[PDB]
Nucleic acid binder design. Structure first.
Ligand SMILES: [Zn+2]
Ligand SMILES: [Zn+2]
Lengths: 199, 556, 235
RNA sequence: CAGAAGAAGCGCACCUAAUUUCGAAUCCAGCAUGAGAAGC
RNA sequence: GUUAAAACUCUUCUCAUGCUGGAUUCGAAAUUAGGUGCGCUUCGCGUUU
């Protein structure tokens, strides 16, 4: 208490990016025109989930170190509530100290989202067997988020930064093994007072 | 509400759900331009009236700073602005001043660029924008932004009766204009060909400076009708590019001139620089070249051969701005003459007659540009017509279009937690009011009341069926015909005219060739069948075109 | 509100200089042959005149009008027919708490499907209308073991009881749905057991949950309620 | 009233834009205070 | 034809206050804008010593 960490996170998109539309009405509206819609706000901005990527990043790296972390990727897997990932991003007993925001673009969908033609080529006749359309985020598009950590601890910005580097290497969103979602993260941290709004 | 930003000029019209922009452009400091561009904010649309740099020059800067989502304009204004922006970037880089934008900003500005013709009503962000021709240059339109809190007519640069390529009477919203944004203004036509007669009979070359947009084509259309025996020659990559633009966009000109060639051959365009050096060494011809204000350009390699030759003349067929070499020798060992008859802007009278031909007198006429002196006498004459006018050196009613039910909502039930009523009615759009109206309405109004070729609906379906199975008409051809038909009807005429056009050199059209054992003559009858079939589909309404074309291309 | 009287009440608000019936100021709304000159005498011709006469004053280039919730149309191709711009539209007016929407047939079709899915998925066969055998102690032992490890949870016991109130068949339907191994994912809807285990053991405890719950549906309601109330005290 | 810099022709077409899985699971549902006063 | 008959336990006073459906879980896994099409056609390093 008495301080709150604020991590101002700026994404620049290096490769193209795809995070699919989750809303059934928006997806079913766009699947008439494009077979892979992108996640988009109702104010026509691009929405990337960021808490799960930071969680998943830290779970893989801390399981690879050998430090005790639970797995919240396995199906219906109960969080332990004792590990550092449970302290940062949450368990079933205590909520997440890090309130990760959604990565929201600084620009509108008609400026950074393009519709693209993808294929499946027959390996033998070297000829298009399948053609789909997908919406991608252009390279250089800028996204912003605030990772607002209540009850600050010492190793809670660095692990986030560590997780950001993992998201720089592996990617964010979908189609991560076809090359989509390679990104760069620029960080600005500040220990804001918890009573800063009291005038 | 409307904000007048203007260095740069712009008209932001904040409707309350969008930020629609009119004519972001700069005629002539880069930093105060950039700050003034930042002052606009994120705009949803950037509407271009005409393709002059006084109203289009800042459009790539707006896509540098990512302040615009869509740049709508006229299909000839777009093609013009391709050449216009590359020429402006050529001059800006060439002057060694730091470029205000880049060629990538030009490209990306044309990536989000949509194009509609005149009389085509778009509906973006709870608004209705419609273009109407105003006869300044080709693709020059006045803009009707029909909002809910007022209907606004941005006149742009209204044209003149001196124009010969564009139809004179400036098209105006047939309905009601609440607020009107007019631009205050800033018979020697026969004299041009006559003094060319006397000059070239005397043995000189008439070197007419002409602006590459509008002006040079007006001068050439003069010479290409007044049977000037001696040869006529345009000398300017950009001038000949806009000459091919006028010939390509011939359907967007005057109705008489929409039956074409338009320039009656006559001109022998000088393409390469070496040919211009040759013509400068050559000794009676009509050099309709283009540097504008006697600045850098294909004029100046010809300027010297007239400058020393008193027998030749140098006919100034344009306004000659200050700090230009042209005004310096306008205001010299050659004859200098000036013909203001070739003017693309109106005078004050034609602005008043553009303002007295609206259906209902505008509430406020915002004068914006022109000379500040002349804007006063225009203002005084239009206040004399009892019309409120807000000058741009100064800074109010609340018009609100409403929708009336006019149906009795008594007998009303709740089915799925919604209080609903199935109703049959006849919604009407009256000036200022949308009125839903019961059959009682149609009854009363019933008792009160009571080009393109032609083929039957079945003929059109049978022809597109045959040409689809002969593979002349394809799914991509039907897709782009639907795309150009969604921009208007003249764009579709220009599309099918371009595809059907036999090239005079190769005898090759752009139609997809047939499938089978057809012969040459029959192949040409199928190509003409395709041309007349799609041109017969242009006459039909958009909702009749769609169900015809969906049985061949399910996605367009 | 600046008011001035003339031989005429010239209220001058910021929403318009109204005048009910000629001042020298700007007049916005005129609340009105002899009639035509009065309008001609006014400098800065009025935006609207609130009145045969209307025909003429329209041709004098002047707007007329001749004498609740916000109405929003959602339905837009109109036509010139019988002078006025117009379209045939049959639809639905809906009366929301702060607005009146004008929707069309697709909205009602949508809410028809959304209501029909609610209607058809409320009664499931013999509601409130070949089981294996187990001793009562064995049911106590297996429900206690599969309650300690987190397979039979309080939500599972609760949802067992709610469906078993609706009959034996709905309980068999629920238990078959929870035990169902989806062929595309290889997963049952049981909550996974806590504690270190092995996939053969986990599959056998899932089978044990299926057989112990199925052997409990053959028992009497009161006997089922008195077995489960020791685990989920609510139901 | 706005920009401008050895020949020739061409710089166009066509297809495809679909399919599939998943949409569950779990914890909690308590506690505390007041039970009187006044007129007729 | 009852030590009767006659006289409404009536009026006044809000089950209110205190408590956020919260916590856990990334629309992503599978699919190369590929396939078809030749910068070609026309013009002697002349002439001059
Ligand atoms: Zn944990
Ligand atoms: Zn102009």
């Amino acid at each position: 208490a008495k301080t709150m960490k604020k991590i101002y996170v700026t994404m620049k998109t290096l490769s193209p990016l795809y995070t699919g539309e989750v809303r059934r009405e928006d997806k079913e509206a766009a699947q008439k025109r494009v077979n892979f819609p992108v996640r988009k706000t109702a104010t026509n901005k691009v929405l990337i989930p960021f808490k799960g990527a930071l969680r998943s990043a830290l779970e893989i790296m801390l399981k690879a170190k050998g430090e005790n972390v639970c797995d919240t990727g396995e199906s219906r897997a109960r969080p332990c509530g004792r590990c550092v990932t449970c302290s940062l991003f949450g368990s079933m007993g205590r909520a997440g100290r890090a309130s990760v925001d959604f990565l929201i673009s600084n620009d509108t969908k008609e400026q950074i989202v393009r519709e693209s033609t993808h294929l499946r080529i027959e390996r033998q006749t070297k000829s298009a067997s399948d053609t789909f359309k997908g919406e991608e985020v252009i390279e250089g598009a800028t996204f912003t988020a605030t990772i607002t950590i209540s009850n600050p601890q010492e190793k809670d910005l660095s692990l986030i930064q560590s997780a950001l580097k993992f998201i720089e290497e592996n990617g964010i969103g979908g189609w991560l093994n076809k090359g989509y979602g390679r990104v760069s993260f620029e960080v600005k941290s500040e220990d804001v007072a918890t009573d800063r709004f009291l005038k | 509400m409307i904000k007048f930003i203007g260095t740069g000029s712009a008209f932001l019209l904040e409707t309350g759900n969008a930020k629609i922009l009119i004519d972001c452009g700069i005629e002539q400091n880069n930093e105060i331009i950039e700050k003034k561009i930042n002052e606009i904010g994120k705009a949803d649309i950037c509407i271009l009236t005409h393709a002059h740099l006084a109203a289009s020059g800042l459009v790539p800067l707006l896509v540098k700073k990512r302040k615009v989502n869509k740049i709508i304009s006229t299909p000839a204004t777009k093609e013009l602005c391709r050449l216009l922006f590359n020429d402006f970037q050529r001059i800006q880089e060439e002057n060694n001043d730091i470029p205000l934008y880049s060629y990538d900003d030009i490209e990306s500005s044309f990536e989000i660029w949509d194009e509609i013709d005149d009389r085509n009503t778009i509906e973006l962000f709870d608004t209705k924008i419609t273009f109407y021709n105003n006869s300044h240059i080709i693709g020059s339109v006045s803009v009707f932004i029909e909002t809910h809190n007022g209907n606004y007519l941005f006149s742009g640069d209204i044209g003149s009766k001196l124009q010969q390529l564009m139809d004179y009477p400036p098209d105006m919203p047939d309905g009601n204009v609440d607020y009107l944004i007019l631009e205050s203004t800033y018979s020697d036509r026969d004299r041009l060909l006559e003094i060319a007669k006397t000059t070239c009979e005397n043995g000189g070359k008439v070197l007419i400076p002409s602006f590459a947009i509008g002006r040079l084509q007006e001068v050439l259309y003069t010479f290409s009708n007044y049977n000037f025996n001696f040869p006529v020659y345009i000398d300017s990559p950009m001038g000949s590019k806009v000459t091919n633009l006028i010939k390509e966009y011939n359907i967007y000109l005057k109705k008489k001139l929409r039956r074409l060639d338009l320039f009656n051959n006559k001109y022998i365009a000088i393409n390469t620089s070496n040919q211009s050096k040759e013509l400068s060494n050559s000794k009676p011809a009509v050099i309709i070249s283009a540097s504008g204000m006697l600045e850098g350009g294909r004029i100046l390699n010809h300027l010297e051969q007239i400058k020393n030759d008193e027998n030749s003349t140098l006919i100034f067929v344009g306004y000659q701005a200050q700090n230009t070499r042209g005004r310096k020798i306008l205001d010299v060992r050659c004859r200098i003459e000036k013909l203001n008859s070739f003017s693309a802007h109106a005078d004050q009278d034609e602005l008043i007659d553009y303002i007295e031909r609206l259906k209902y007198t505008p509430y406020k006429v915002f004068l914006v540009h022109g000379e500040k002196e002349q804007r006063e006498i225009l203002a005084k004459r239009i206040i004399s017509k009892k019309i409120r006018v807000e000058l741009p050196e100064n800074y109010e009613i609340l018009i609100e279009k409403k929708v009336v039910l006019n149906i009795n909502t008594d007998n009303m039930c709740n089915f799925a937690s919604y209080r609903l009523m199935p109703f049959s009615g006849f919604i009407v759009e009256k000036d200022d009011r949308i009125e839903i109206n019961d059959k009682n309405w149609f009854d009363m109004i019933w008792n009160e009341e009571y080009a393109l070729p032609d083929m039957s609906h079945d003929k059109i379906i049978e022809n597109i069926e045959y040409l689809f199975n002969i593979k002349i008409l394809s799914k991509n051809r039907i897709k782009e015909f639907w795309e150009e038909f969604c921009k208007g009807q003249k764009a579709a005429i220009k599309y099918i005219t371009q595809v059907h056009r036999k090239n005079p050199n190769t005898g090759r059209r752009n139609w997809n060739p047939p499938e089978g054992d057809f012969t040459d003559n029959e192949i040409e009858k199928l190509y003409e069948t395709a041309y007349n079939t799609l041109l017969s589909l242009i006459k039909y309404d958009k909702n009749k075109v769609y169900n015809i074309l969906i049985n061949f291309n399910p996605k367009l």
